[PDB]
Short mmCIF file of C-alpha atoms in Angstrom, two decimals:
data_model
loop_
_atom_site.label_atom_id
_atom_site.label_comp_id
_atom_site.label_asym_id
_atom_site.label_seq_id
_atom_site.Cartn_x
_atom_site.Cartn_y
_atom_site.Cartn_z
CA UNK D 1 0.08 0.07 0.09
CA UNK D 2 0.99 3.58 -0.17
CA UNK D 3 0.95 5.84 2.85
CA UNK D 4 -2.40 6.76 3.93
CA UNK D 5 -2.28 9.77 6.33
CA UNK D 6 -5.65 9.45 8.64
CA UNK D 7 -6.86 12.56 10.96
CA UNK D 8 -9.01 12.12 14.35
CA UNK D 9 -12.85 12.78 14.31
CA UNK D 10 -14.67 15.79 13.75
CA UNK D 11 -14.59 17.91 17.05
CA UNK D 12 -16.40 20.34 18.93
CA UNK D 13 -15.24 22.89 20.98
CA UNK D 14 -15.98 25.70 23.49
CA UNK D 15 -14.48 29.44 22.64
CA UNK D 16 -11.11 29.52 25.25
CA UNK D 17 -10.55 25.97 24.71
CA UNK D 18 -7.86 23.84 23.06
CA UNK D 19 -8.51 21.04 20.28
CA UNK D 20 -5.76 18.81 19.34
CA UNK D 21 -6.02 16.84 15.51
CA UNK D 22 -4.48 13.68 15.01
CA UNK D 23 -2.38 12.63 11.92
CA UNK D 24 -1.43 8.95 11.58
CA UNK D 25 0.72 7.59 8.44
CA UNK D 26 -1.37 4.47 8.20
CA UNK D 27 1.34 2.45 6.26
CA UNK D 28 4.03 4.57 6.25
CA UNK D 29 6.29 7.29 8.29
CA UNK D 30 6.64 10.82 9.26
CA UNK D 31 10.48 10.64 9.55
CA UNK D 32 12.29 12.65 7.40
CA UNK D 33 9.17 13.99 5.69
CA UNK D 34 7.67 17.56 6.11
CA UNK D 35 4.77 17.36 8.12
CA UNK D 36 2.12 20.38 7.10
CA UNK D 37 -1.13 21.45 8.54
CA UNK D 38 -3.48 23.51 6.58
CA UNK D 39 -7.16 24.86 7.23
CA UNK D 40 -9.93 25.82 5.46
CA UNK D 41 -12.75 27.89 6.61
CA UNK D 42 -16.46 27.11 5.11
CA UNK D 43 -16.68 28.50 1.32
CA UNK D 44 -13.23 30.12 1.38
CA UNK D 45 -9.78 28.64 0.67
CA UNK D 46 -6.77 27.21 1.69
CA UNK D 47 -4.68 28.75 5.17
CA UNK D 48 -0.98 27.18 5.60
CA UNK D 49 -0.86 26.61 9.21
CA UNK D 50 2.86 25.68 9.67
CA UNK D 51 5.18 22.58 8.56
CA UNK D 52 7.23 20.75 11.14
CA UNK D 53 10.53 18.09 10.44
CA UNK D 54 10.26 15.53 13.40
CA UNK D 55 13.43 14.32 12.42
CA UNK D 56 15.23 17.56 12.67
CA UNK D 57 12.79 19.17 15.67
CA UNK D 58 12.32 22.30 13.52
CA UNK D 59 8.88 23.90 12.71
CA UNK D 60 7.99 27.12 10.69
CA UNK D 61 4.36 28.61 11.47
CA UNK D 62 2.12 31.08 9.68
CA UNK D 63 2.55 34.30 11.65
CA UNK D 64 -0.85 34.20 11.85
CA UNK D 65 -0.84 31.28 14.25
CA UNK D 66 2.95 31.96 15.88
CA UNK D 67 1.95 30.68 18.35
CA UNK D 68 -1.39 29.23 19.69
CA UNK D 69 -0.51 26.34 16.94
CA UNK D 70 1.91 23.57 18.13
CA UNK D 71 2.59 20.45 15.55
CA UNK D 72 4.25 17.57 17.39
CA UNK D 73 4.78 14.01 16.19
CA UNK D 74 4.74 10.37 17.66
CA UNK D 75 7.47 8.04 18.31
CA UNK D 76 6.90 6.10 16.96
CA UNK D 77 7.03 9.13 15.03
CA UNK D 78 4.20 7.80 13.15
CA UNK D 79 1.73 10.00 14.28
CA UNK D 80 1.65 13.76 14.12
CA UNK D 81 -0.68 16.31 16.28
CA UNK D 82 -1.59 19.97 15.65
CA UNK D 83 -2.69 21.45 18.99
CA UNK D 84 -4.52 24.91 18.67
CA UNK D 85 -5.05 26.84 22.18
CA UNK D 86 -7.58 29.67 23.01
CA UNK D 87 -10.24 28.89 20.33
CA UNK D 88 -12.69 31.52 19.22
CA UNK D 89 -15.60 31.39 16.56
CA UNK D 90 -12.96 32.55 13.87
CA UNK D 91 -11.32 29.00 14.18
CA UNK D 92 -14.06 27.01 12.85
CA UNK D 93 -12.76 25.24 9.82
CA UNK D 94 -11.80 21.70 8.16
CA UNK D 95 -8.23 21.04 9.37
CA UNK D 96 -6.10 19.21 6.59
CA UNK D 97 -2.77 17.46 7.51
CA UNK D 98 -0.34 16.50 4.19
CA UNK D 99 3.14 15.58 4.07
CA UNK D 100 5.96 16.65 1.62
CA UNK D 101 8.89 15.23 0.81
CA UNK D 102 12.14 17.39 2.44
CA UNK D 103 13.43 20.78 0.94
CA UNK D 104 11.00 20.10 -1.91
CA UNK D 105 7.48 22.30 -1.35
CA UNK D 106 4.79 20.72 -2.28
CA UNK D 107 2.87 18.19 -0.04
CA UNK D 108 1.90 15.13 -2.34
CA UNK D 109 -0.13 13.15 0.61
CA UNK D 110 -2.88 14.55 2.19
CA UNK D 111 -5.12 13.41 5.19
CA UNK D 112 -8.76 13.22 4.61
CA UNK D 113 -9.54 16.59 6.83
CA UNK D 114 -11.29 17.18 10.21
CA UNK D 115 -13.95 19.71 11.15
CA UNK D 116 -13.56 21.54 14.16
CA UNK D 117 -16.69 23.42 15.36
CA UNK D 118 -15.94 26.47 17.91
CA UNK D 119 -19.33 27.22 19.49
CA UNK D 120 -21.46 26.75 22.67
CA UNK D 121 -24.32 25.99 21.30
CA UNK D 122 -25.58 22.62 22.91
CA UNK D 123 -25.21 19.03 21.09
CA UNK D 124 -28.69 18.84 19.52
CA UNK D 125 -29.50 15.55 17.81
CA UNK D 126 -30.84 15.49 14.16
CA UNK D 127 -34.70 14.36 13.23
CA UNK D 128 -35.26 12.17 10.22
CA UNK D 129 -38.34 12.99 8.29
CA UNK D 130 -39.11 10.98 5.02
CA UNK D 131 -40.15 12.52 1.76
CA UNK D 132 -42.23 10.71 -0.57
CA UNK D 133 -44.95 11.64 -3.15
CA UNK D 134 -47.62 11.10 -0.30
CA UNK D 135 -50.87 12.79 -2.51
CA UNK D 141 -42.42 7.09 -15.34
CA UNK D 142 -39.61 8.03 -12.70
CA UNK D 143 -39.97 8.59 -8.83
CA UNK D 144 -37.96 10.80 -7.00
CA UNK D 145 -37.77 10.60 -3.09
CA UNK D 146 -35.72 12.01 -0.24
CA UNK D 147 -34.54 12.54 3.14
CA UNK D 148 -35.01 15.45 5.61
CA UNK D 149 -32.02 16.00 8.34
CA UNK D 150 -33.36 18.46 10.34
CA UNK D 151 -32.85 20.91 13.28
CA UNK D 152 -29.33 19.05 14.59
CA UNK D 153 -25.94 20.36 15.74
CA UNK D 154 -22.79 20.57 14.99
CA UNK D 155 -21.88 19.57 11.43
CA UNK D 156 -21.81 16.86 10.28
CA UNK D 157 -23.88 14.23 9.26
CA UNK D 158 -23.38 11.51 7.04
CA UNK D 159 -26.62 9.85 4.40
CA UNK D 160 -26.62 7.12 2.38
CA UNK D 161 -29.27 5.35 -0.03
CA UNK D 162 -29.28 1.64 0.48
CA UNK D 163 -26.25 1.78 2.59
CA UNK D 164 -24.27 2.78 -0.78
CA UNK D 165 -26.08 0.22 -2.81
CA UNK D 166 -27.82 3.37 -4.57
CA UNK D 167 -25.31 6.04 -5.33
CA UNK D 168 -26.58 7.25 -8.88
CA UNK D 169 -29.62 9.46 -9.28
CA UNK D 170 -28.70 10.76 -5.72
CA UNK D 171 -28.46 14.70 -4.79
CA UNK D 172 -27.49 15.25 -1.03
CA UNK D 173 -27.52 18.77 -0.53
CA UNK D 174 -25.10 21.11 1.88
CA UNK D 175 -26.49 21.48 5.15
CA UNK D 176 -27.81 24.97 5.91
CA UNK D 177 -27.86 26.43 9.27
CA UNK D 178 -31.24 28.57 10.52
CA UNK D 179 -32.08 29.54 14.13
CA UNK D 180 -28.61 28.18 15.02
CA UNK D 181 -29.68 24.84 13.92
CA UNK D 182 -28.30 22.57 10.85
CA UNK D 183 -31.00 21.30 8.03
CA UNK D 184 -30.23 18.94 5.42
CA UNK D 185 -31.99 17.45 2.58
CA UNK D 186 -30.98 14.24 0.34
CA UNK D 187 -32.96 13.02 -2.96
CA UNK D 188 -32.52 10.09 -4.76
CA UNK D 189 -34.33 9.41 -8.18
CA UNK D 190 -34.99 5.79 -9.40
CA UNK D 191 -37.10 3.93 -11.95
CA UNK D 192 -40.93 3.85 -11.31
CA UNK D 193 -40.43 0.31 -11.49
CA UNK D 194 -38.20 0.28 -8.43
CA UNK D 195 -40.21 1.96 -5.97
CA UNK D 196 -42.16 1.09 -4.29
CA UNK D 197 -42.01 -2.49 -5.80
CA UNK D 198 -38.49 -2.77 -3.91
CA UNK D 199 -37.69 -0.76 -1.02
CA UNK D 200 -35.51 2.44 -0.22
CA UNK D 201 -33.81 3.36 2.82
CA UNK D 202 -32.09 6.59 4.24
CA UNK D 203 -28.77 5.97 6.27
CA UNK D 204 -28.44 9.10 8.67
CA UNK D 205 -25.65 9.67 11.26
CA UNK D 206 -24.88 12.13 13.80
CA UNK D 207 -21.71 10.82 15.65
CA UNK D 208 -22.08 14.22 18.18
CA UNK D 209 -25.03 13.03 19.47
CA UNK D 210 -24.83 8.91 18.78
CA UNK D 211 -27.74 8.87 16.67
CA UNK D 212 -27.59 6.43 14.07
CA UNK D 213 -30.95 6.30 12.21
CA UNK D 214 -32.46 4.37 9.09
CA UNK D 215 -35.86 5.24 7.67
CA UNK D 216 -37.68 3.33 4.75
CA UNK D 217 -39.38 4.75 2.14
CA UNK X 5 17.88 28.41 7.19
CA UNK X 6 15.14 26.67 6.12
CA UNK X 7 16.02 25.37 3.67
CA UNK X 8 14.45 22.01 4.86
CA UNK X 9 11.28 23.06 3.40
CA UNK X 10 11.87 24.14 -0.02
CA UNK X 11 14.84 24.56 -2.64
CA UNK X 12 15.29 27.67 -4.85
CA UNK X 13 15.11 25.86 -8.48
CA UNK C 2 3.63 39.79 1.86
CA UNK C 3 3.86 37.83 -1.00
CA UNK C 4 0.42 37.63 -3.74
CA UNK C 5 -0.88 34.78 -5.77
CA UNK C 6 -3.58 35.53 -7.91
CA UNK C 7 -6.37 33.16 -9.10
CA UNK C 8 -9.27 34.06 -10.92
CA UNK C 9 -12.52 33.04 -9.48
CA UNK C 10 -13.94 31.02 -12.72
CA UNK C 11 -12.82 29.36 -15.22
CA UNK C 12 -15.32 27.75 -17.61
CA UNK C 13 -14.74 25.57 -20.62
CA UNK C 14 -16.06 23.15 -22.99
CA UNK C 15 -16.65 19.47 -23.02
CA UNK C 16 -13.54 18.43 -24.56
CA UNK C 17 -11.52 21.61 -25.00
CA UNK C 18 -8.83 22.97 -23.05
CA UNK C 19 -8.75 24.51 -19.60
CA UNK C 20 -6.28 27.00 -18.46
CA UNK C 21 -5.75 28.37 -14.90
CA UNK C 22 -3.36 31.31 -14.36
CA UNK C 23 -1.44 31.74 -10.77
CA UNK C 24 -0.10 35.24 -10.92
CA UNK C 25 2.49 37.32 -8.43
CA UNK C 26 5.55 39.20 -8.73
CA UNK C 27 8.68 37.38 -10.69
CA UNK C 28 6.78 34.07 -10.16
CA UNK C 29 9.04 32.24 -12.65
CA UNK C 30 11.72 32.07 -10.19
CA UNK C 31 9.65 30.12 -7.65
CA UNK C 32 8.88 26.41 -8.20
CA UNK C 33 5.22 26.42 -8.36
CA UNK C 34 2.75 23.55 -7.50
CA UNK C 35 -1.16 22.93 -7.91
CA UNK C 36 -3.72 21.20 -6.01
CA UNK C 37 -7.06 20.30 -7.04
CA UNK C 38 -9.79 19.85 -4.52
CA UNK C 39 -13.36 18.31 -4.97
CA UNK C 40 -16.44 19.15 -2.91
CA UNK C 41 -16.35 17.30 0.19
CA UNK C 42 -12.98 15.94 -0.76
CA UNK C 43 -9.08 16.81 0.58
CA UNK C 44 -6.89 18.42 -1.77
CA UNK C 45 -5.24 16.57 -4.52
CA UNK C 46 -1.56 17.28 -5.94
CA UNK C 47 -2.02 17.46 -9.57
CA UNK C 48 1.88 19.60 -10.55
CA UNK C 49 4.65 20.01 -9.01
CA UNK C 50 7.78 22.07 -9.58
CA UNK C 51 5.95 23.90 -12.54
CA UNK C 52 5.49 20.86 -15.01
CA UNK C 53 6.31 17.64 -13.16
CA UNK C 54 3.35 15.27 -12.42
CA UNK C 55 2.94 13.12 -9.62
CA UNK C 56 2.00 9.15 -9.53
CA UNK C 57 -1.83 8.60 -10.89
CA UNK C 58 -2.22 12.31 -12.60
CA UNK C 59 -3.55 12.08 -16.00
CA UNK C 60 -1.06 13.25 -18.75
CA UNK C 61 -3.87 15.97 -19.82
CA UNK C 62 -2.44 17.76 -16.54
CA UNK C 63 0.66 20.23 -17.71
CA UNK C 64 2.16 23.08 -16.07
CA UNK C 65 4.18 26.13 -17.02
CA UNK C 66 5.93 28.96 -15.31
CA UNK C 67 7.47 31.82 -16.59
CA UNK C 68 7.87 35.39 -15.61
CA UNK C 69 5.16 36.47 -13.59
CA UNK C 70 2.31 33.97 -14.39
CA UNK C 71 2.39 30.03 -13.75
CA UNK C 72 0.17 27.91 -15.86
CA UNK C 73 -2.01 24.91 -15.07
CA UNK C 74 -2.97 23.35 -18.20
CA UNK C 75 -5.91 20.99 -18.13
CA UNK C 76 -6.45 18.75 -21.53
CA UNK C 77 -9.73 17.36 -23.33
CA UNK C 78 -11.79 18.29 -20.13
CA UNK C 79 -14.29 15.98 -18.57
CA UNK C 80 -17.20 16.59 -16.05
CA UNK C 81 -14.74 14.33 -13.73
CA UNK C 82 -12.66 17.59 -13.77
CA UNK C 83 -14.84 19.87 -11.94
CA UNK C 84 -13.12 21.33 -9.19
CA UNK C 85 -11.39 24.26 -7.04
CA UNK C 86 -7.67 24.64 -8.31
CA UNK C 87 -4.97 26.00 -5.93
CA UNK C 88 -1.88 27.47 -6.60
CA UNK C 89 1.10 27.49 -4.22
CA UNK C 90 4.49 28.24 -3.74
CA UNK C 91 7.14 29.21 -0.84
CA UNK C 92 8.18 33.03 -0.36
CA UNK C 93 10.22 33.69 2.61
CA UNK C 94 9.53 31.05 5.35
CA UNK C 95 5.94 30.75 4.08
CA UNK C 96 3.58 28.74 1.96
CA UNK C 97 1.17 30.98 0.18
CA UNK C 98 -1.85 29.52 -1.58
CA UNK C 99 -3.98 31.46 -4.01
CA UNK C 100 -7.83 31.93 -3.94
CA UNK C 101 -10.08 29.15 -5.71
CA UNK C 102 -10.12 28.94 -9.03
CA UNK C 103 -13.49 27.14 -9.79
CA UNK C 104 -13.12 24.94 -13.10
CA UNK C 105 -16.82 24.72 -14.54
CA UNK C 106 -17.59 22.64 -17.77
CA UNK C 107 -20.27 24.34 -20.17
CA UNK C 108 -23.05 22.23 -21.41
CA UNK C 109 -26.52 21.93 -22.95
CA UNK C 110 -29.16 23.55 -21.36
CA UNK C 111 -31.57 21.24 -19.33
CA UNK C 112 -34.89 22.22 -17.62
CA UNK C 113 -35.14 21.49 -13.59
CA UNK C 114 -36.85 18.56 -12.50
CA UNK C 115 -39.54 19.92 -9.60
CA UNK C 116 -40.91 17.44 -7.07
CA UNK C 117 -42.94 18.62 -4.12
CA UNK C 118 -43.19 16.66 -1.03
CA UNK C 119 -45.77 17.04 1.64
CA UNK C 120 -44.71 17.07 5.47
CA UNK C 121 -44.25 13.73 7.10
CA UNK C 122 -46.57 11.99 9.23
CA UNK C 123 -44.06 11.79 11.74
CA UNK C 124 -43.03 15.39 11.55
CA UNK C 125 -46.75 16.44 11.78
CA UNK C 126 -47.09 14.67 15.16
CA UNK C 127 -43.92 16.63 16.15
CA UNK C 128 -46.04 19.50 15.69
CA UNK C 129 -44.20 20.96 12.55
CA UNK C 130 -44.50 21.26 8.73
CA UNK C 131 -42.09 21.59 6.19
CA UNK C 132 -42.47 21.31 2.38
CA UNK C 133 -39.56 20.34 0.08
CA UNK C 134 -39.19 20.99 -3.50
CA UNK C 135 -36.73 19.42 -5.08
CA UNK C 136 -35.30 21.27 -8.50
CA UNK C 137 -33.26 18.77 -10.05
CA UNK C 138 -30.41 18.25 -12.82
CA UNK C 139 -30.73 21.90 -14.69
CA UNK C 140 -28.25 24.27 -16.22
CA UNK C 141 -27.22 27.05 -16.41
CA UNK C 142 -26.99 27.34 -12.76
CA UNK C 143 -29.52 30.32 -12.25
CA UNK C 144 -32.73 29.64 -11.05
CA UNK C 145 -35.53 31.09 -8.72
CA UNK C 146 -37.86 29.41 -6.60
CA UNK C 147 -40.99 30.90 -5.60
CA UNK C 148 -43.17 29.76 -3.03
CA UNK C 149 -47.07 30.18 -2.80
CA UNK C 150 -49.35 29.34 -0.14
CA UNK C 151 -52.80 29.66 -1.46
CA UNK C 152 -51.62 31.63 -4.81
CA UNK C 153 -49.96 34.36 -2.19
CA UNK C 154 -46.33 34.40 -2.35
CA UNK C 155 -43.94 33.68 1.18
CA UNK C 156 -40.63 34.87 1.48
CA UNK C 157 -39.66 34.08 4.71
CA UNK C 158 -39.71 30.42 6.04
CA UNK C 159 -37.48 29.77 3.40
CA UNK C 160 -34.24 27.61 3.34
CA UNK C 161 -32.38 27.36 0.19
CA UNK C 162 -29.35 24.87 -0.66
CA UNK C 163 -27.23 24.21 -3.99
CA UNK C 164 -25.20 21.43 -4.96
CA UNK C 165 -21.76 21.82 -6.80
CA UNK C 166 -21.47 21.27 -10.23
CA UNK C 167 -22.32 17.38 -10.65
CA UNK C 168 -19.46 15.38 -11.39
CA UNK C 169 -21.26 13.22 -14.01
CA UNK C 170 -23.48 15.23 -16.10
CA UNK C 171 -22.19 18.80 -15.63
CA UNK C 172 -25.48 19.85 -14.11
CA UNK C 173 -27.08 21.62 -11.22
CA UNK C 174 -29.49 20.79 -8.14
CA UNK C 175 -31.48 22.90 -5.42
CA UNK C 176 -33.09 21.91 -2.26
CA UNK C 177 -35.85 24.61 -0.92
CA UNK C 178 -37.42 23.84 2.05
CA UNK C 179 -40.70 25.70 3.40
CA UNK C 180 -40.67 25.01 6.99
CA UNK C 181 -43.92 26.00 9.42
CA UNK C 182 -45.63 25.46 12.70
CA UNK C 183 -48.28 23.11 12.29
CA UNK C 184 -50.90 24.95 13.16
CA UNK C 185 -49.76 26.95 10.16
CA UNK C 186 -49.79 24.63 7.62
CA UNK C 187 -53.42 24.12 8.84
CA UNK C 188 -54.78 27.34 8.01
CA UNK C 189 -54.20 26.92 4.20
CA UNK C 190 -54.60 24.60 1.56
CA UNK C 191 -52.84 25.04 -1.71
CA UNK C 192 -49.07 24.84 -1.60
CA UNK C 193 -47.05 25.63 -4.56
CA UNK C 194 -43.40 26.04 -5.82
CA UNK C 195 -42.77 27.78 -8.87
CA UNK C 196 -39.34 27.65 -10.69
CA UNK C 197 -38.07 30.10 -12.67
CA UNK C 198 -35.32 29.15 -14.76
CA UNK C 199 -34.04 30.33 -18.15
CA UNK C 200 -35.08 27.53 -20.34
CA UNK C 201 -38.70 28.65 -20.34
CA UNK C 202 -40.68 31.34 -20.33
CA UNK C 203 -43.12 30.30 -17.93
CA UNK C 204 -42.21 29.02 -14.57
CA UNK C 205 -42.62 25.28 -13.72
CA UNK C 206 -45.21 24.63 -11.06
CA UNK C 207 -45.07 21.95 -8.85
CA UNK C 208 -48.19 22.17 -6.11
CA UNK C 209 -50.41 20.11 -4.00
CA UNK C 210 -53.63 20.86 -1.73
CA UNK C 211 -53.99 19.46 1.75
CA UNK C 212 -57.23 18.73 1.21
CA UNK C 213 -56.36 15.95 -0.94
CA UNK C 214 -53.36 14.43 0.52
#
């Protein structure tokens, strides 16, 4: 296999606190490589946070974070950590790790990104309502409503249905999130056979399947 | 002194 | 500071070539790297050191950097190329990224597939009513939705969401949800969403009446 960088899960933190995301080189090493962290506020672009060479014990930090941010790595030297203290609402963003070979500049291996929400808003579980034509080809939907914080995950027949699906970016209202997904199939499919909507809110331990 | 991150072509 | 400049949008035809520019002062003296990022996904290295390509990256992707403009070139564009592109360099102990360039693929005009959905039985018991209008697989991007409760417009109450351009047929989707108190739902009858899209002079209407569902 070729190295896969894997980050810890989405986090929620209240302003003033600290967050620490992990970056493990599943199937490889962080030694004599440049480990880099980069963030992205929603809708906006990439923001370098720092680089770190575990094998030289030297770091470089974006002036903007120097030094609320602290990039460390594990001995083994197989996992890298980013610790960002003094959290604020501004620091709500997806957080990526990546890895570049020494003295090259580029980073050719990226982690999968970890979401960090910085709010005082209480963790609320979603509510999942189905969408059907109550009243040639059929269009159905799930409605995942009034949850917090991001994110949720939504599947259709547990991924056995991926085409014809349109999952919509959540939106936030009255300090709460709402999200829809639509799936369209051939009319000889529903309700001849069943369609189930697979929703997941890790923040509230909420897993919910929904038939029809 | 940080030429451990990038080279100068 | 050092400043990389990327155009916000670059739209090209299916099959033709896309060229994304990264401008900065004396940029040809720096080794320029390019990253592709699709919606939801992490960034992927597509070009490094101006012209070199990593593993797994199609030959169609090429780069050039001379003067004050690095250029990413994508040849024979497919919808599988729809993504944001970042240009990156080093300058004085710092990594600098450009603002995204969103590469959008042009295509045939398509009307929206509109589908309305009543509130759920389950939700109603909770005490709430939300009507959902799905406007799917249309092109160009711009669309307007009007929600009408008994032939009257409702402006407030609504929450809209638009997909990123579809990776498969280069189209757009919108979800619009009108959410109420249940008491409210029960005060009127017809619920209508009209879609105003360029493909037709006459808006598209999907409605229902409460006394029939």
